[PDB]
Design an enzyme around this catalytic site. Structure first.
Site, PDB file in Angstrom:
ATOM      1  N   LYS A  36      -4.574 -33.095 -23.579  1.00  0.00           N
ATOM      2  CA  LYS A  36      -5.620 -32.101 -23.335  1.00  0.00           C
ATOM      3  C   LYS A  36      -6.926 -32.544 -23.993  1.00  0.00           C
ATOM      4  CE  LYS A  36      -6.650 -27.134 -24.040  1.00  0.00           C
ATOM      5  NZ  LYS A  36      -6.005 -25.778 -24.139  1.00  0.00           N
ATOM      6  N   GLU A  85       3.502 -31.260 -24.893  1.00  0.00           N
ATOM      7  CA  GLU A  85       4.677 -31.382 -24.036  1.00  0.00           C
ATOM      8  C   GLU A  85       4.244 -31.301 -22.568  1.00  0.00           C
ATOM      9  OE1 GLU A  85       7.441 -28.203 -24.699  1.00  0.00           O
ATOM     10  OE2 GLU A  85       8.665 -28.651 -22.928  1.00  0.00           O
ATOM     11  N   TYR A  86       4.727 -32.233 -21.746  1.00  0.00           N
ATOM     12  CA  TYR A  86       4.412 -32.248 -20.313  1.00  0.00           C
ATOM     13  C   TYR A  86       5.332 -31.288 -19.552  1.00  0.00           C
ATOM     14  CZ  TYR A  86       4.989 -34.222 -15.492  1.00  0.00           C
ATOM     15  OH  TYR A  86       5.136 -34.396 -14.134  1.00  0.00           O
ATOM     16  N   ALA A  87       4.733 -30.379 -18.779  1.00  0.00           N
ATOM     17  CA  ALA A  87       5.485 -29.436 -17.948  1.00  0.00           C
ATOM     18  C   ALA A  87       5.470 -29.887 -16.487  1.00  0.00           C
ATOM     19  CB  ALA A  87       4.911 -28.031 -18.074  1.00  0.00           C
ATOM     20  N   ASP A 130      -3.858 -13.997 -24.310  1.00  0.00           N
ATOM     21  CA  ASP A 130      -4.396 -14.632 -23.100  1.00  0.00           C
ATOM     22  C   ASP A 130      -3.281 -15.003 -22.128  1.00  0.00           C
ATOM     23  OD1 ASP A 130      -6.454 -15.507 -21.436  1.00  0.00           O
ATOM     24  OD2 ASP A 130      -6.523 -17.519 -22.308  1.00  0.00           O
ATOM     25  N   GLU A 134      -2.186 -18.874 -15.050  1.00  0.00           N
ATOM     26  CA  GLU A 134      -2.651 -20.251 -15.226  1.00  0.00           C
ATOM     27  C   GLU A 134      -2.243 -20.829 -16.593  1.00  0.00           C
ATOM     28  OE1 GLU A 134      -6.618 -18.808 -14.746  1.00  0.00           O
ATOM     29  OE2 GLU A 134      -7.357 -19.802 -16.562  1.00  0.00           O
ATOM     30  N   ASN A 135      -1.828 -19.958 -17.513  1.00  0.00           N
ATOM     31  CA  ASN A 135      -1.362 -20.395 -18.829  1.00  0.00           C
ATOM     32  C   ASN A 135       0.159 -20.317 -18.969  1.00  0.00           C
ATOM     33  OD1 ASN A 135      -4.000 -20.892 -19.679  1.00  0.00           O
ATOM     34  ND2 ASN A 135      -4.214 -18.906 -20.720  1.00  0.00           N
ATOM     35  N   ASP A 148      -1.404 -22.612 -23.922  1.00  0.00           N
ATOM     36  CA  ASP A 148      -2.807 -22.262 -24.180  1.00  0.00           C
ATOM     37  C   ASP A 148      -2.962 -21.190 -25.260  1.00  0.00           C
ATOM     38  OD1 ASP A 148      -5.525 -22.007 -24.132  1.00  0.00           O
ATOM     39  OD2 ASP A 148      -5.693 -21.524 -22.004  1.00  0.00           O
TER      40      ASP A 148
HETATM   41  N1  ADP Z   1       1.423 -29.521 -20.732  1.00  0.00           N
HETATM   42  C1  ADP Z   1       0.955 -29.403 -19.463  1.00  0.00           C
HETATM   43  N2  ADP Z   1       1.645 -29.865 -18.393  1.00  0.00           N
HETATM   44  C2  ADP Z   1       1.170 -29.741 -17.136  1.00  0.00           C
HETATM   45  N3  ADP Z   1      -0.008 -29.159 -16.831  1.00  0.00           N
HETATM   46  C3  ADP Z   1      -0.800 -28.649 -17.813  1.00  0.00           C
HETATM   47  C4  ADP Z   1      -0.345 -28.748 -19.208  1.00  0.00           C
HETATM   48  N4  ADP Z   1      -1.293 -28.178 -19.976  1.00  0.00           N
HETATM   49  C5  ADP Z   1      -2.277 -27.751 -19.149  1.00  0.00           C
HETATM   50  N5  ADP Z   1      -1.983 -28.031 -17.863  1.00  0.00           N
HETATM   51  C6  ADP Z   1      -2.851 -27.697 -16.709  1.00  0.00           C
HETATM   52  O1  ADP Z   1      -4.214 -27.700 -17.148  1.00  0.00           O
HETATM   53  C7  ADP Z   1      -4.763 -26.376 -17.103  1.00  0.00           C
HETATM   54  C8  ADP Z   1      -5.618 -26.081 -18.331  1.00  0.00           C
HETATM   55  O2  ADP Z   1      -4.860 -26.161 -19.542  1.00  0.00           O
HETATM   56  P1  ADP Z   1      -5.201 -25.139 -20.748  1.00  0.00           P
HETATM   57  O3  ADP Z   1      -4.496 -25.671 -21.968  1.00  0.00           O
HETATM   58  O4  ADP Z   1      -4.889 -23.753 -20.245  1.00  0.00           O
HETATM   59  O5  ADP Z   1      -6.813 -25.321 -20.852  1.00  0.00           O
HETATM   60  P2  ADP Z   1      -7.896 -24.188 -21.258  1.00  0.00           P
HETATM   61  O6  ADP Z   1      -7.681 -23.959 -22.728  1.00  0.00           O
HETATM   62  O7  ADP Z   1      -9.212 -24.869 -20.965  1.00  0.00           O
HETATM   63  O8  ADP Z   1      -7.582 -22.995 -20.387  1.00  0.00           O
HETATM   64  C9  ADP Z   1      -3.571 -25.438 -16.998  1.00  0.00           C
HETATM   65  O9  ADP Z   1      -3.898 -24.232 -16.301  1.00  0.00           O
HETATM   66  C10 ADP Z   1      -2.564 -26.285 -16.249  1.00  0.00           C
HETATM   67  O10 ADP Z   1      -2.871 -26.235 -14.857  1.00  0.00           O
HETATM   68 MG    MG Z   2      -8.038 -22.527 -24.234  1.00  0.00          MG
HETATM   69 MG    MG Z   3      -5.827 -21.958 -20.024  1.00  0.00          MG
END
Ligand code: ADP
Ligand code: MG
Ligand code: MG
Ligand code: A98
Length: 265
Positions: A36, A85-87, A130, A134-135, A148
Protein backbone atom coordinates in the site's frame (compact mmCIF):
# COMPACT_ATOMS: atom_id res chain seq x y z
CA UNK A 1 14.70 -2.92 7.55
CA UNK A 2 12.68 -3.55 4.38
CA UNK A 3 13.17 -1.22 1.41
CA UNK A 4 11.75 -0.91 -2.11
CA UNK A 5 14.69 -2.76 -3.64
CA UNK A 6 13.52 -5.93 -1.85
CA UNK A 7 10.31 -6.29 -3.88
CA UNK A 8 9.19 -6.89 -7.45
CA UNK A 9 6.02 -4.89 -8.16
CA UNK A 10 3.12 -6.19 -10.23
CA UNK A 11 -0.58 -5.67 -10.96
CA UNK A 12 -2.39 -2.65 -9.47
CA UNK A 13 -4.89 -4.05 -6.95
CA UNK A 14 -6.87 -0.91 -6.20
CA UNK A 15 -6.94 2.79 -5.42
CA UNK A 16 -8.07 4.77 -2.39
CA UNK A 17 -8.01 8.45 -1.40
CA UNK A 18 -4.37 8.11 -0.38
CA UNK A 19 -3.61 4.44 -0.92
CA UNK A 20 -2.31 3.10 -4.21
CA UNK A 21 -2.12 -0.66 -3.73
CA UNK A 22 -0.02 -3.14 -5.76
CA UNK A 23 0.62 -6.86 -5.91
CA UNK A 24 4.28 -7.54 -5.02
CA UNK A 25 6.75 -10.37 -4.41
CA UNK A 26 9.64 -10.25 -1.95
CA UNK A 27 12.77 -11.20 -3.86
CA UNK A 28 14.59 -13.75 -1.70
CA UNK A 29 11.59 -15.55 -0.19
CA UNK A 30 9.25 -15.17 -3.20
CA UNK A 31 6.55 -14.22 -0.66
CA UNK A 32 3.47 -12.68 -2.35
CA UNK A 33 1.91 -9.69 -0.64
CA UNK A 34 0.22 -6.33 -1.15
CA UNK A 35 2.10 -3.02 -1.01
CA UNK A 36 0.00 0.00 0.00
CA UNK A 37 1.72 3.16 -1.26
CA UNK A 38 1.12 6.60 0.27
CA UNK A 39 2.56 9.91 -0.91
CA UNK A 40 4.11 11.95 1.90
CA UNK A 41 3.16 15.27 0.29
CA UNK A 42 -0.52 14.29 0.23
CA UNK A 43 -0.39 12.99 3.81
CA UNK A 44 1.20 16.22 5.08
CA UNK A 45 -1.25 18.34 3.08
CA UNK A 46 -4.33 16.60 4.49
CA UNK A 47 -2.77 16.46 7.96
CA UNK A 48 -3.47 12.76 8.46
CA UNK A 49 -0.11 11.46 9.73
CA UNK A 50 -1.76 10.43 13.01
CA UNK A 51 -4.22 8.31 11.01
CA UNK A 52 -1.35 6.48 9.31
CA UNK A 53 0.42 5.80 12.62
CA UNK A 54 -2.85 4.48 14.04
CA UNK A 55 -3.36 2.20 11.07
CA UNK A 56 0.12 0.73 11.52
CA UNK A 57 -0.03 0.48 15.31
CA UNK A 58 -3.50 -1.01 15.70
CA UNK A 59 -3.58 -3.34 12.68
CA UNK A 60 -0.10 -4.82 13.17
CA UNK A 61 -0.93 -6.02 16.68
CA UNK A 62 -4.35 -7.58 15.99
CA UNK A 63 -4.43 -11.31 15.14
CA UNK A 64 -7.73 -12.77 13.89
CA UNK A 65 -8.68 -14.85 10.80
CA UNK A 66 -11.25 -12.25 9.77
CA UNK A 67 -8.90 -9.26 10.04
CA UNK A 68 -6.26 -8.43 7.41
CA UNK A 69 -2.63 -8.62 8.61
CA UNK A 70 -0.20 -5.71 8.46
CA UNK A 71 3.37 -7.04 8.56
CA UNK A 72 5.37 -3.80 8.55
CA UNK A 73 6.31 -0.58 6.77
CA UNK A 74 9.15 1.41 5.21
CA UNK A 75 9.58 4.86 3.65
CA UNK A 76 11.73 6.64 1.04
CA UNK A 77 11.37 10.49 1.19
CA UNK A 78 8.42 10.79 -1.19
CA UNK A 79 6.46 7.72 -0.16
CA UNK A 80 5.38 5.50 2.72
CA UNK A 81 4.85 1.78 2.06
CA UNK A 82 2.64 -0.53 4.14
CA UNK A 83 3.30 -4.28 3.81
CA UNK A 84 -0.07 -6.08 3.84
CA UNK A 85 -1.50 -9.58 3.60
CA UNK A 86 -2.67 -10.13 0.00
CA UNK A 87 -6.41 -10.87 -0.36
CA UNK A 88 -6.75 -12.85 -3.61
CA UNK A 89 -10.55 -12.79 -4.14
CA UNK A 90 -10.85 -9.01 -3.99
CA UNK A 91 -13.41 -6.73 -2.32
CA UNK A 92 -16.99 -7.33 -1.24
CA UNK A 93 -17.71 -4.10 -3.17
CA UNK A 94 -16.70 -5.71 -6.48
CA UNK A 95 -18.63 -8.86 -5.60
CA UNK A 96 -21.79 -6.82 -4.96
CA UNK A 97 -21.46 -5.04 -8.31
CA UNK A 98 -21.11 -8.44 -10.00
CA UNK A 99 -24.23 -9.99 -8.46
CA UNK A 100 -26.42 -6.90 -7.70
CA UNK A 101 -27.72 -8.45 -4.43
CA UNK A 102 -26.61 -11.28 -2.12
CA UNK A 103 -28.96 -14.11 -1.08
CA UNK A 104 -29.77 -14.70 2.58
CA UNK A 105 -27.13 -17.41 3.13
CA UNK A 106 -24.30 -15.30 1.71
CA UNK A 107 -25.45 -12.24 3.66
CA UNK A 108 -25.78 -14.03 7.01
CA UNK A 109 -22.38 -15.69 6.59
CA UNK A 110 -20.68 -12.34 5.86
CA UNK A 111 -22.44 -10.77 8.85
CA UNK A 112 -21.26 -13.60 11.14
CA UNK A 113 -17.66 -13.12 9.98
CA UNK A 114 -17.85 -9.34 10.48
CA UNK A 115 -19.36 -9.72 13.95
CA UNK A 116 -16.63 -12.18 14.99
CA UNK A 117 -13.92 -9.77 13.84
CA UNK A 118 -15.60 -6.78 15.49
CA UNK A 119 -16.14 -8.67 18.75
CA UNK A 120 -12.38 -9.25 18.85
CA UNK A 121 -11.69 -5.56 18.12
CA UNK A 122 -14.15 -4.31 20.73
CA UNK A 123 -12.61 -6.56 23.40
CA UNK A 124 -9.60 -4.24 23.09
CA UNK A 125 -11.87 -1.18 22.88
CA UNK A 126 -10.77 -0.64 19.29
CA UNK A 127 -13.48 0.80 17.06
CA UNK A 128 -13.06 0.67 13.28
CA UNK A 129 -15.45 3.49 12.27
CA UNK A 130 -15.03 2.94 8.49
CA UNK A 131 -16.75 -0.37 7.80
CA UNK A 132 -17.94 -0.37 4.17
CA UNK A 133 -17.80 -2.79 1.19
CA UNK A 134 -14.60 -1.33 -0.35
CA UNK A 135 -12.76 -2.02 2.93
CA UNK A 136 -13.92 -5.64 3.21
CA UNK A 137 -11.60 -8.08 1.42
CA UNK A 138 -11.88 -11.77 0.56
CA UNK A 139 -9.43 -14.55 1.39
CA UNK A 140 -8.57 -17.60 -0.70
CA UNK A 141 -11.49 -19.57 0.74
CA UNK A 142 -13.89 -16.67 0.22
CA UNK A 143 -13.76 -15.65 3.88
CA UNK A 144 -14.31 -11.98 4.76
CA UNK A 145 -11.47 -9.88 6.19
CA UNK A 146 -11.75 -6.35 7.62
CA UNK A 147 -9.11 -3.94 6.30
CA UNK A 148 -8.22 -0.22 6.15
CA UNK A 149 -7.75 0.77 9.81
CA UNK A 150 -6.84 4.40 9.11
CA UNK A 151 -9.96 5.72 10.84
CA UNK A 152 -9.81 3.38 13.85
CA UNK A 153 -9.43 4.63 17.45
CA UNK A 154 -9.89 3.73 21.12
CA UNK A 155 -13.30 4.53 22.66
CA UNK A 156 -14.79 6.83 23.79
CA UNK A 157 -13.98 9.46 21.19
CA UNK A 158 -14.65 12.68 19.31
CA UNK A 159 -13.81 13.29 15.67
CA UNK A 160 -10.72 15.44 15.21
CA UNK A 161 -10.55 15.13 11.40
CA UNK A 162 -12.71 16.14 8.39
CA UNK A 163 -15.27 13.69 6.96
CA UNK A 164 -14.08 13.10 3.40
CA UNK A 165 -16.54 11.27 1.15
CA UNK A 166 -19.77 9.34 1.64
CA UNK A 167 -21.93 9.65 4.77
CA UNK A 168 -23.75 6.42 3.91
CA UNK A 169 -22.31 4.15 6.62
CA UNK A 170 -22.02 6.60 9.53
CA UNK A 171 -24.46 6.83 12.50
CA UNK A 172 -26.20 10.07 13.62
CA UNK A 173 -23.85 10.69 16.57
CA UNK A 174 -20.82 10.78 14.29
CA UNK A 175 -22.30 12.82 11.45
CA UNK A 176 -23.46 15.37 14.05
CA UNK A 177 -19.91 15.52 15.41
CA UNK A 178 -20.96 14.21 18.80
CA UNK A 179 -19.38 11.90 21.29
CA UNK A 180 -19.26 8.25 20.18
CA UNK A 181 -18.15 4.71 21.11
CA UNK A 182 -18.20 1.04 20.03
CA UNK A 183 -21.86 1.23 19.04
CA UNK A 184 -20.88 3.09 15.85
CA UNK A 185 -19.68 -0.17 14.28
CA UNK A 186 -22.99 -1.81 15.08
CA UNK A 187 -24.91 0.85 13.17
CA UNK A 188 -22.61 0.25 10.18
CA UNK A 189 -23.25 -3.50 10.46
CA UNK A 190 -26.96 -2.76 10.03
CA UNK A 191 -26.33 -0.57 6.98
CA UNK A 192 -24.25 -3.37 5.43
CA UNK A 193 -26.80 -6.10 6.13
CA UNK A 194 -29.37 -3.95 4.33
CA UNK A 195 -27.06 -3.16 1.38
CA UNK A 196 -26.11 -6.85 1.03
CA UNK A 197 -29.76 -7.94 0.70
CA UNK A 198 -31.13 -4.95 -1.24
CA UNK A 199 -28.26 -3.78 -3.47
CA UNK A 200 -27.94 -0.25 -2.08
CA UNK A 201 -27.55 1.31 1.41
CA UNK A 202 -30.76 2.37 3.22
CA UNK A 203 -30.15 6.15 3.45
CA UNK A 204 -28.78 6.70 -0.05
CA UNK A 205 -29.73 10.00 -1.71
CA UNK A 206 -28.69 12.41 -4.47
CA UNK A 207 -27.04 15.00 -2.25
CA UNK A 208 -24.91 15.16 0.89
CA UNK A 209 -27.52 17.41 2.47
CA UNK A 210 -30.37 14.94 1.87
CA UNK A 211 -28.35 11.89 2.96
CA UNK A 212 -27.57 13.77 6.17
CA UNK A 213 -31.29 14.31 6.80
CA UNK A 214 -32.24 10.68 6.12
CA UNK A 215 -29.56 9.43 8.52
CA UNK A 216 -30.31 11.82 11.40
CA UNK A 217 -34.01 10.90 11.14
CA UNK A 218 -33.39 7.18 10.48
CA UNK A 219 -35.65 7.23 7.42
CA UNK A 220 -35.49 3.84 5.68
CA UNK A 221 -38.03 1.41 4.20
CA UNK A 222 -37.86 -2.23 3.03
CA UNK A 223 -38.62 -3.70 -0.40
CA UNK A 224 -41.23 -6.48 -0.30
CA UNK A 225 -38.67 -9.26 -0.81
CA UNK A 226 -36.83 -8.65 2.49
CA UNK A 227 -38.04 -11.31 4.94
CA UNK A 228 -39.32 -10.77 8.51
CA UNK A 229 -36.16 -12.11 10.11
CA UNK A 230 -33.88 -9.80 8.15
CA UNK A 231 -36.15 -6.84 8.93
CA UNK A 232 -36.00 -7.60 12.65
CA UNK A 233 -32.20 -7.70 12.76
CA UNK A 234 -31.74 -4.58 10.63
CA UNK A 235 -34.32 -2.60 12.64
CA UNK A 236 -32.53 -3.52 15.89
CA UNK A 237 -29.19 -2.28 14.57
CA UNK A 238 -30.39 0.98 12.99
CA UNK A 239 -31.45 2.67 16.23
CA UNK A 240 -30.90 6.41 16.69
CA UNK A 241 -29.99 5.90 20.34
CA UNK A 242 -26.65 3.99 20.47
CA UNK A 243 -27.35 2.33 23.83
CA UNK A 244 -30.41 0.67 22.26
CA UNK A 245 -28.34 -1.11 19.60
CA UNK A 246 -27.77 -4.82 20.40
CA UNK A 247 -24.47 -6.35 21.57
CA UNK A 248 -22.49 -8.41 19.07
CA UNK A 249 -23.39 -11.60 20.96
CA UNK A 250 -27.05 -10.80 20.24
CA UNK A 251 -26.23 -10.40 16.54
CA UNK A 252 -24.38 -13.73 16.39
CA UNK A 253 -27.24 -15.47 18.23
CA UNK A 254 -30.12 -13.85 16.29
CA UNK A 255 -32.46 -16.58 14.90
CA UNK A 256 -32.20 -15.32 11.31
CA UNK A 257 -28.40 -15.38 11.54
CA UNK A 258 -28.33 -18.92 12.99
CA UNK A 259 -30.86 -20.19 10.44
CA UNK A 260 -28.92 -18.86 7.44
CA UNK A 261 -25.19 -18.52 8.25
CA UNK A 262 -22.83 -21.32 7.19
CA UNK A 263 -20.14 -20.42 9.74
CA UNK A 264 -20.12 -20.30 13.58
CA UNK A 265 -19.18 -17.78 16.28
N1 ADP B 1 -4.40 -6.55 0.88
C1 ADP B 1 -5.10 -6.28 -0.25
N2 ADP B 1 -5.35 -7.22 -1.19
C2 ADP B 1 -6.05 -6.94 -2.31
N3 ADP B 1 -6.56 -5.72 -2.59
C3 ADP B 1 -6.38 -4.68 -1.73
C4 ADP B 1 -5.63 -4.92 -0.49
N4 ADP B 1 -5.59 -3.75 0.18
C5 ADP B 1 -6.26 -2.84 -0.56
N5 ADP B 1 -6.73 -3.40 -1.70
C6 ADP B 1 -7.51 -2.67 -2.73
O1 ADP B 1 -7.11 -1.30 -2.72
C7 ADP B 1 -8.19 -0.46 -2.26
C8 ADP B 1 -7.69 0.62 -1.31
O2 ADP B 1 -7.09 0.07 -0.14
P1 ADP B 1 -7.28 0.84 1.27
O3 ADP B 1 -6.28 0.23 2.22
O4 ADP B 1 -8.75 0.79 1.60
O5 ADP B 1 -6.88 2.35 0.85
P2 ADP B 1 -7.49 3.73 1.46
O6 ADP B 1 -6.94 3.81 2.85
O7 ADP B 1 -6.91 4.78 0.54
O8 ADP B 1 -8.99 3.57 1.38
C9 ADP B 1 -9.18 -1.40 -1.59
O9 ADP B 1 -10.52 -0.91 -1.68
C10 ADP B 1 -8.98 -2.68 -2.36
O10 ADP B 1 -9.71 -2.60 -3.59
MG1 MG C 1 -7.33 4.74 4.71
MG1 MG D 1 -10.27 2.08 2.03
C1 A98 E 1 8.38 -9.62 2.75
C2 A98 E 1 8.12 -9.83 4.22
S1 A98 E 1 6.48 -10.58 4.39
C3 A98 E 1 6.48 -11.02 6.07
N1 A98 E 1 7.21 -10.65 7.11
N2 A98 E 1 6.84 -11.31 8.34
C4 A98 E 1 5.86 -12.19 8.19
N3 A98 E 1 5.31 -12.96 9.20
C5 A98 E 1 4.35 -13.91 8.98
O1 A98 E 1 3.99 -14.32 7.90
O2 A98 E 1 3.85 -14.30 10.16
C6 A98 E 1 2.73 -15.20 10.10
S2 A98 E 1 5.35 -12.21 6.56
Amino acid sequence: QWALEDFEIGRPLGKGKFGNVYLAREKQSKFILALKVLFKAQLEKAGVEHQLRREVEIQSHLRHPNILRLYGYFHDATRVYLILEYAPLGTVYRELQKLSKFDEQRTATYITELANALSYCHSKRVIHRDIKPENLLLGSAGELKIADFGWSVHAPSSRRTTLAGTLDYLPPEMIEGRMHDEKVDLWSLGVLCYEFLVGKPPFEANTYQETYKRISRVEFTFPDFVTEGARDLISRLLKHNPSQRPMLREVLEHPWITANSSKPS
